[PDB]
Amino acid sequence: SEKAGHQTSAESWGTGRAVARIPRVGGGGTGRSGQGAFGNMCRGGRMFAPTK
């Protein structure tokens, strides 16, 4: 599905917070909040070169 892996509003924290620069989920009190988001290496992310 073309939506898969991209139904998220994540953004990168940037350098300076002792964490890598992959985008991350916002908010709090959820468990998903703060996770790696879009990248192909990220759990729940989008696969490299989605099959068309």
Partner: peptide
């Protein structure tokens, strides 16, 4: 769950120049 934030900020000053 436990949110996290920018722990301290500031208090580092500036160096050399």
């Amino acid at each position: 769950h436990h949110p996290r934030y920018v722990v301290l900020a500031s208090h580092l000053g500036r160096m050399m120049m």
